Amino acid sequence: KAVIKNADMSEEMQADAVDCATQALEKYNIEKDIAAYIKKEFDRKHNPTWHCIVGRNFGSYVTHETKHFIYFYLGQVAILLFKS
């Protein structure tokens, strides 16, 4: 289940982020494949640039533009997503 530690986006876009994370965790095995799936899928619809990091032990320092950011847990993986 999605424990959203830190999000700065609207509700629908957050829900779509969680759904895309679920599909990525279901379909791919290695981490970079999941990251690329998330980033490319959010490039396809939301806005043309995105950045994603999937892992278990990390905390970034980014410069995201407001209204787009998430850092949440799915299963046992931390997914960090932001546009810049």
Next chain:
Amino acid sequence: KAVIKNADMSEEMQADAVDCATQALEKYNIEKDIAAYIKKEFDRKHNPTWHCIVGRNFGSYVTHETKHFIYFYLGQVAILLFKS
């Protein structure tokens, strides 16, 4: 010591990044602090936009501005440093 798994910068810039990371590693024992330190020093050193992720388990897919990217290990910790 330091091994550069991936680089897309000039030799001087990569050397400066390695120096920044090793300098950070003697001050900060929490990983977000290393991310912050690196992000500030490349923020003031270069064109202001930057991004840094540090950890021991993560996989990413970042669209980075050309001629600016690095992914390298110090000790046991991986650092991904790039510009949007």
Next chain:
Amino acid sequence: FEVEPILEVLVGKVLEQGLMEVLEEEELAAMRAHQEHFEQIRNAELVATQRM
């Protein structure tokens, strides 16, 4: 460069699956061998006791 990723993932997957299967098979066969060794001693001593 188009064959690098498939190659690396397949090689590692095959090696890991093979090692795990070998360890499990060795353990099962060895347990079967211990059970068979006990079963034969038991039967021999049963025959001796019946004779007595």
Next chain:
Amino acid sequence: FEVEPILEVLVGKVLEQGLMEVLEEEELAAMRAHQEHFEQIRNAELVATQRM
């Protein structure tokens, strides 16, 4: 939640192996004690004949 399967595996190994070992040790001990009992009877009979 992550250590549960390791616990289950190790505990299963310990239980089944220990139970099997104890049963087989007991079974052989009983049979060999029976044989020793018969041998003791035979030795006593020998001693009686020698006495006569």
Next chain:
Amino acid sequence: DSQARIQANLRHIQAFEAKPNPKALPETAVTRGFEKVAFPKLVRELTCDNAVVRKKSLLAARELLSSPVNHVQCVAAGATPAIVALLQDQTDDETRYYAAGTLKLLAAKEVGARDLAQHSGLDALAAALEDPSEGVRDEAYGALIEAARFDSTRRALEACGSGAVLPRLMELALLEAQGGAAGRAQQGLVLLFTCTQARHNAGILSQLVDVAQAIPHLAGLLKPELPMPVRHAAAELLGALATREDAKIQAVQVGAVPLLLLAASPSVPVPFATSAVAALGAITIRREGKYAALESPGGLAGLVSVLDPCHEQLCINAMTAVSNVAEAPEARAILVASGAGPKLQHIFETATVEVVKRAAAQAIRQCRFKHLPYEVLPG
């Protein structure tokens, strides 16, 4: 190295390429979700709507049941009912083959066997043993044999319906009577033997001997015409059955004492010799066994030729057979004539394994006695 340098720079350009999109996978594609997501996904994918998805998921499960940890997590997630349900499908034989193989992989560990028994999987395997296909029968035999390693599975096989071991022996005899398929028969007979070794075998023996009339069938399947592993399995099954006294009486009544002696010689593969001489050691407890061993043209000579310090189980089986036979009045004179004296003396003298040393002392004392007072055991 200009060409090498241009190749390197060109490769570096092709590296950071901005790939277009992860195009969508087809419906018939299986993969492992990161970490634990795969085990719940598998038990869903085992019950999807499309057949090829279910078959490829069966293959993925066979991959997923190797390590003990993945076995535990996959059986807790509820894999066994799906696999047995797929096995019971009769429309496509291939799926039955892969399902039987998958169950063989499943039943290796204790929890797999217990959950296979609880979900009525043993009944499914028993039904599948008569599948008109060929490979699936071998896989089912292997799965049943590997499940029967545990006593609980043996007991569950003992009482599951009315007759389970009975039609198993019936099928072995049926397939040996028509054709010459020996792998299936040998697998079934060794499975039956593993059933007889259950700790409380009173029910398992009673069923076999009483209703199935196994002893004449095994005596007919002991002839030197059949392949040697079949003879090995039949001899071992007879040796296991002969614990009952009625089994001894009927075994000697149908014969089968000359045939076991026919397998004792120092020119035979060790396992068959060990099984035959163990069965003989069991049978010769009865009087008729001793006089049938003495009556056979080449019995005791072979039994004394078998004695050798190496091939240890064979040696101890021969020693027990000699001890049993030498209780007869005339037999002693034959055994001392065939040189059993010095042979057993050497076996006792030079050996260090305690059980065989005890068998040797008993055999020596048994061969040199003519009066009821019994001398102290050698050593």
Next chain:
Amino acid sequence: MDVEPIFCAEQIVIPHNLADILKAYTKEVIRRQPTDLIAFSAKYFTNLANVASGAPAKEQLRQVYTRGTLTESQVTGLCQADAVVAKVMEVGAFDLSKFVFLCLAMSCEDFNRVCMGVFDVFSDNGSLPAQDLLTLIAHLGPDMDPEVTPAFLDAVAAELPAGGGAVTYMELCEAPSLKPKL
């Protein structure tokens, strides 16, 4: 279990049953722990190719273990139960007769059939020398079958013809101390 990276073109298609072949090959390499993996793999793949095309190397390994350069022997064996052994001996035409003798002994039913096969294989035309047959019989010796100790060897040599002379099958069947063996 399909393996499909996110970014891999359709120009590269993995043949089916490649995973299983590498599965088996890796398992055998892990079991055997060879010292020279390259020739080991060559021998392995030749073995499986021949076996699928239409059991030389399992029997060859068992015979080599029983006996207690080898690549040439394995190659000769894989390119060929008494006719095949005779053909291998002829292609050898000569650690090269002990292997053939042991492979004939292991397949033999009893000592009489073993002696008949030894006469057939060690020399053609139906007869062989008398020291060669003695050496071939002593090849069994200890740890293979009892009643072949040096005393019986000396007795059989005395009961046989002279070393240079030839000993046929009938001249060995009626020899002293050899009738008890049969």
Next chain:
Amino acid sequence: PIFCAEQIVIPHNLADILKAYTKEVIRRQPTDLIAFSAKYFTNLANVA
């Protein structure tokens, strides 16, 4: 900094001891398992 399942260390000498432990129990088959187990482990510690 444990973050993955495989990080958990299973000691070499663990299972053997555990089996010996269950041996004693299944030899005595007691009812005050906790007390007897505490006595047995304390005995093993004080003798080792």
Next chain:
Amino acid sequence: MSSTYQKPITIPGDFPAILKAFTREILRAQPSNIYEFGARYFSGLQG
């Protein structure tokens, strides 16, 4: 051998739970000496 030599012996019944709890604690604690940790753990468990 049906019943004369085979004495029915079975797991005490409430031993699995105790053993699983002890295994969880020994894995999580990760002590230097298993005997000392087991002694202290069971002593505390009793009272």
Next chain:
Amino acid sequence: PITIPGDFPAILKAFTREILRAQPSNIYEFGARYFSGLQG
């Protein structure tokens, strides 16, 4: 002591590269020829 041989991953890596490059219809004889050729 059941480990993967210290040199095996690279050898299997190269073999996979070549078999994926060539696309044969018989992996067994392909391995035979490949390993025999590399041996010399």
